[PDB]
Enzyme design. Structure first.
Site, PDB file in Angstrom:
ATOM      1  N   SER A   1       0.793  -1.247   0.000  1.00 19.15           N
ATOM      2  CA  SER A   1       0.000   0.000   0.000  1.00 19.15           C
ATOM      3  C   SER A   1       0.813   1.277   0.000  1.00 19.15           C
ATOM      4  CB  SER A   1      -0.860   0.071   1.248  1.00 19.15           C
ATOM      5  OG  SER A   1      -1.821  -0.968   1.171  1.00 19.15           O
TER       6      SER A   1
ATOM      7  N   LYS B   1       0.071   3.342  -2.979  1.00 22.70           N
ATOM      8  CA  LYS B   1      -0.964   4.385  -2.978  1.00 22.70           C
ATOM      9  C   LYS B   1      -0.450   5.797  -3.039  1.00 22.70           C
ATOM     10  CE  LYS B   1      -4.341   1.623  -0.431  1.00 22.70           C
ATOM     11  NZ  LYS B   1      -3.746   0.276  -0.351  1.00 22.70           N
TER      12      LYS B   1
ATOM     13  N   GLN C   1     -10.745  -5.162   0.862  1.00 19.48           N
ATOM     14  CA  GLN C   1     -10.325  -5.798  -0.400  1.00 19.48           C
ATOM     15  C   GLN C   1     -11.535  -6.046  -1.291  1.00 19.48           C
ATOM     16  OE1 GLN C   1      -7.185  -6.071  -0.864  1.00 19.48           O
ATOM     17  NE2 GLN C   1      -6.232  -6.187   1.209  1.00 19.48           N
TER      18      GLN C   1
ATOM     19  N   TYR D   1     -10.650   2.096   5.325  1.00 22.79           N
ATOM     20  CA  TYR D   1      -9.492   1.915   4.441  1.00 22.79           C
ATOM     21  C   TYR D   1      -9.774   0.834   3.411  1.00 22.79           C
ATOM     22  CZ  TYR D   1      -4.422   1.087   3.558  1.00 22.79           C
ATOM     23  OH  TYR D   1      -3.185   1.077   2.941  1.00 22.79           O
TER      24      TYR D   1
ATOM     25  N   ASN E   1      -8.895  -0.872  -0.690  1.00 27.45           N
ATOM     26  CA  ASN E   1      -8.257  -0.986  -1.997  1.00 27.45           C
ATOM     27  C   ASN E   1      -9.197  -0.713  -3.131  1.00 27.45           C
ATOM     28  OD1 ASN E   1      -5.381  -1.541  -1.485  1.00 27.45           O
ATOM     29  ND2 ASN E   1      -6.034  -3.569  -0.767  1.00 27.45           N
TER      30      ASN E   1
ATOM     31  N   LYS F   1       3.488   6.431   5.371  1.00 25.07           N
ATOM     32  CA  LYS F   1       2.575   5.449   4.818  1.00 25.07           C
ATOM     33  C   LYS F   1       3.164   4.074   5.163  1.00 25.07           C
ATOM     34  CE  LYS F   1      -1.110   4.066   2.892  1.00 25.07           C
ATOM     35  NZ  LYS F   1      -1.088   2.831   3.707  1.00 25.07           N
TER      36      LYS F   1
ATOM     37  N   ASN G   1       5.713  -9.548   6.317  1.00 22.13           N
ATOM     38  CA  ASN G   1       4.646  -8.634   6.822  1.00 22.13           C
ATOM     39  C   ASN G   1       4.609  -8.691   8.359  1.00 22.13           C
ATOM     40  OD1 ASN G   1       2.206  -7.295   7.520  1.00 22.13           O
ATOM     41  ND2 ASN G   1       0.939  -8.330   5.948  1.00 22.13           N
TER      42      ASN G   1
END
Length: 367
Positions: free
Chosen positions: A62, A65, A118, A149, A151, A314, A342
């Protein structure tokens, strides 16, 4: 003098976190008055024993973005769209749907009315299936009232920005945006000649993972880049005026705050805080509930320039990777932290904060 203590500082910030989260590999790049400093840790690939370097490519998830927002800033600067445009103005196939009533700014800032985190599983990377998804979508909340938030949300904003410019998103990024920012190690689709630099991502139980194709993946989470190139992007953000004027203004358009949630002011891509702020308040602003739950916005009377004593950041993830970027216009300080796990946003912020706060402490008069 600030460069003198930086290796000890970045090592202390990074290595305990890499250990606590079993991060195979991690690259740090810091800009201090425009001087770049790199610190690479561990492995890009376990299987092949390839070390992380400042040229290792990581998925930034992300953080993409903010590139998406820059393309939109370009479209805005060139008078191809305005943030108050109805979404369906830029995609006639959406006329007659709920996107007649949803603005580009809503999409960009996750306030369209509860577009999901998503796309549903059933939505393939396919123009018609994406189009049909938006056509049939019904809102959870009133537009402009809740941040969730999403996508599909900023995804559609980028895809629309590209239509306004008359070209596919990926081409615009690859032929105009990345060349304009001087980024030659930044890809939506890693070319053959660069694959050796693409790090493996690691999931639970060290499952190797690299992001698969997805609807509007390019717009939401598609960028692979090196720590050295992402730092170049950060440096462009710190000094937009060092670019050809159409791109300076495009970056400037990503530095404008629209509303607040808690301590966080939402920009196009970038999220901003007052600096200094505590470690715990910055982690809260980057918390799982911030990302996963809806929140009531505090709308600003007017867009706020995200400049001075502010930190812009971010986070970005994929199943295998965890990125974080932050910059402080008022200290001329930028930072990128890219990892092939992650690992939690609170730990990314922990590393960044140690670095930022270590550098600030250094600036005091000796008494």
């Amino acid at each position: 003098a600030p460069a003198d203590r930086l290796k000890a500082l970045v090592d202390a910030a990074v290595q305990p976190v890499m250990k606590a989260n079993d991060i195979p590999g991690l690259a740090v790049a810091i800009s201090l008055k425009g001087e770049p400093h790199y610190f690479s840790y561990g492995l890009a690939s376990k299987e092949d024993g390839r070390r992380v370097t400042p040229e290792t490519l990581f998925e930034i998830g992300s953080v993409s973005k903010t590139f998406t927002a820059t393309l939109a800033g370009y479209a805005l600067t060139q008078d191809k769209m305005r943030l108050d445009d109805r979404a369906s103005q830029h995609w006639p196939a959406l006329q007659g749907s709920r996107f007649d009533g949803i603005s580009l700014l809503d999409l960009a800032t996750y306030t369209a009315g509860g577009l999901p985190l998503q796309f549903p599983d059933s939505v393939q990377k396919d123009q018609a299936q994406i189009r049909d998804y938006y056509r049939q979508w019904q809102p959870t909340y009133a537009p402009g009232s809740q941040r969730l938030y999403s996508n599909p949300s900023i995804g559609l904003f980028g895809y629309l920005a590209a239509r306004s410019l008359g070209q596919p998103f990926e081409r615009l990024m690859e032929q105009q945006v990345f060349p304009a920012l001087g980024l030659e190690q930044t890809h939506l689709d890693v070319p053959e000649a660069a694959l050796a630099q693409y790090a493996q991502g690691y999931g639970k139980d060290d499952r190797p993972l690299r992001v698969g194709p997805g609807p509007l993946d390019a717009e939401g989470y598609g960028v692979k880049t090196s720590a050295a190139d992402l730092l170049r992007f950060v440096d462009a953000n710190l000094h937009p005026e060092r670019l050809d004027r159409p791109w300076a203004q495009a970056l400037d358009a990503t530095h404008r705050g629209y509303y607040k949630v808690g301590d966080m002011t939402q920009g196009l891509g970038w999220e901003a805080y007052d600096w200094p702020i505590s470690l715990k308040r910055l982690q809260a602003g980057n918390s799982t509930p911030m990302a996963l739950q809806p929140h009531r916005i505090a709308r600003l009377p007017a867009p706020q320039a995200l400049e001075g004593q502010r930190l812009l950041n971010k986070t970005g993830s994929t199943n295998g990777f965890g990125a974080y970027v932050a910059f402080v216009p008022g200290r001329d300080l930028g930072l990128v932290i890219l990892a092939n796990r992650n690992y939690p946003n609170a730990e990314r912020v922990k590393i960044a904060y140690a670095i930022l706060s270590g550098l600030e402490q250094q600036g005091k008069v000796p008494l």
